[PDB]
């Protein structure tokens, strides 16, 4: 997260860290046994880490659980990044408490101007590399589709939305992928892609979760 602030230990209870010997993606806990993340975060040997703040130190409240199965959307296109969503089933149910809790799926899509909270342990520098120990947060509004399509001509699908600041300085970045975009207590987006990080006129692009609620529910129901 570039230009964000330190969230505060366990203030974003649904935030998870995908780990394969190092943190590589974020995710959102949607129930005691399922996590939502980005399809491009897929890899074998994923360990889901819940209740984290400092990802380099065991401070208490953490729950390390192996992924029993990762379900990349059948129609995910690695070239266009369309349908960039993945469901991860935990080997065992997480113990839900104040520090570890699930986030609600939306019943409707969010409109332009809606203010959201984006979080992650990704790079904090637009020009260079600096990964934080603790979870970072950023409040950002959902942009109008016209501005989004003007910024990325021919690259925005109906399953994507832009969120951020056109003036630059604040944005998600490498290492934030798969993380949550929560607006009004509902999971509206998943960190996906962007041209650079926090660049002028190049806002972050996110997977539009409201388009996948039926798929998520039907898939969880049969697995």
């Amino acid at each position: 997260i570039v230009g964000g602030y330190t969230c505060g230990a366990n203030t974003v209870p649904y935030q998870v860290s995908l780990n394969s010997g190092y943190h590589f993606c974020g995710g959102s806990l949607i129930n005691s046994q399922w996590v939502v993340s980005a399809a491009h975060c897929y890899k074998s040997g994923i360990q889901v880490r819940l209740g984290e703040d400092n990802i380099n130190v065991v401070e208490g409240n953490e729950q390390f659980i192996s992924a029993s199965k990762s379900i990349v959307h059948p129609s995910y296109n690695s070239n266009t990044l369309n349908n960039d969503i993945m469901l991860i089933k935990l080997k065992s149910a997480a113990s839900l408490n104040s520090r570890v809790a699930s986030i609600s799926l939306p019943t409707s899509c969010a409109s332009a101007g809606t203010q959201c909270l984006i979080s992650g342990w990704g790079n904090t520098k637009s020009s260079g590399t600096s990964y934080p120990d603790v979870l970072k947060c950023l409040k950002a509004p959902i942009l109008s589709d016209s501005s989004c399509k003007s910024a990325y001509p021919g690259q925005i699908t109906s399953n994507m939305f832009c969120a951020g600041y056109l003036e630059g300085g604040k944005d998600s970045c490498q290492g934030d992928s798969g993380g949550p975009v929560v607006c009004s207590g509902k999971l509206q987006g998943i960190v996906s892609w962007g041209s650079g990080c926090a660049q002028k006129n190049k806002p972050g692009v996110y997977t539009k979760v409201c388009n996948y609620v039926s798929w998520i529910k039907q898939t969880i129901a049969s697995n």
Partner: peptide
């Protein structure tokens, strides 16, 4: 591009 490491 994608905001993982580094796709």
């Amino acid at each position: 591009x994608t905001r993982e490491l580094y796709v």
